[PDB]
Amino acid sequence: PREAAAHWVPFEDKANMPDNVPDVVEVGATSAPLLSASYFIGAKCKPYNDDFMLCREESQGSGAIDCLKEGRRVTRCAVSVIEDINKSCLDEFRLHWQCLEQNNHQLSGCRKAEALLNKCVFTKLNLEKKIPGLRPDEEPVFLKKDPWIKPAVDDFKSVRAYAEAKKNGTL
């Protein structure tokens, strides 16, 4: 909650999780994959994330020590979603975040590999993107046609893959 110093000195601690907290399977995904898979781990693990932030709320100040049980379970189910999207659509997932690693990770620049990934995951893994809080008669922005904000360079591999998905008729 605070921005670093004049002269901040980094340090780590070669230590262990002491006795009673079991070992966990932590997310080893970088900014591009979990920014890509954000809506899908938000769609599957909604009540676990809700439950963790609720438990963090109810133990005011106890907080960190209180819900070790339960931030254990949001990690497990987020790891579950991203293992499933690996084994499901590694190629098109990879296409989307190889797109999204350029363009400042702006989501604006990569509609083309996105819609391909969304078809793939909605088919095999049957999870769907929703922007909640969006009242009807308001189109969600990743569905509209001819947007005002277009990227600088459409990346090449998603141009090719989207054109071949047009030709195959899967899109």
Binding site: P1, E57, Q60, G61
Partner: peptide
């Protein structure tokens, strides 16, 4: 605005 759940006491 940037509020954290677990601040009430």
């Amino acid at each position: 605005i940037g509020k954290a759940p677990g601040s009430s006491r």
